[PDB]
Ligand binder design. Structure first.
Ligand code: 2AN
Length: 159
């Protein structure tokens, strides 16, 4: 079945720039700005649109070795990005996939709000518990803050 978790968070970076950097160039940026959270990002198949598979490797000592993420949809107009965790880490005989949706909305103060949905699809009925969702939110927030700091310090990046 499906467990749905939603959260919101804010950024001081304008939506279109954040989307370009944080969403569209995560493969380059994440290992660069947050090597302590993501060791590498490998493009396995696809040119960036629906169906593109990436392998995200975590550094030694992390709970999981890697996940493979599949790009589901990329909306350049409305700053929406949907992707699914389809292999590795928590995926296996109890969890089929985690389907994620991210939308970035402009705010009049020149920042943005990120609205995030994560839907865990389980095999049989055993539950997703707070600890796995908490860890996921922590990682996402660490990645956001690292990218934000980089975009603040490198004004010519992603204009
Ligand atoms: O979805 S993620 O792709 O990890 C993600 C991507 C980008 C930014 C995120 C910010 C906060 C939490 C996330 N994950 C999250 C995890 C559990 C519950 C709610 C949000 C973020």
């Amino acid at each position: 079945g499906v467990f749905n978790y939603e959260t919101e968070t804010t950024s001081v970076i304008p939506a279109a720039r954040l989307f370009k950097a944080f969403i569209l160039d995560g493969d380059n940026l994440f290992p660069k700005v947050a090597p302590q959270a993501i060791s590498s990002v490998e493009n396995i198949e696809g040119n960036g649109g629906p169906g593109t598979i990436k392998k995200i490797s975590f550094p030694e000592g992390f709970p999981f070795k890697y996940v493979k993420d599949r790009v589901d949809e990329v909306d350049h107009t409305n700053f929406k990005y949907n992707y699914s965790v389809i292999e590795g880490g928590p995926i296996g005989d109890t969890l089929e996939k985690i389907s994620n949706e991210i939308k970035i909305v402009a705010t009049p103060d020149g920042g943005s709000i990120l609205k995030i949905s994560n839907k865990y699809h389980t095999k049989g009925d055993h539950e997703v518990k707070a600890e796995q969702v908490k860890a996921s939110k922590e990682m996402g927030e660490t990645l956001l803050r690292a990218v934000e700091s980089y975009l603040l310090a490198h004004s010519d990046a992603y204009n």
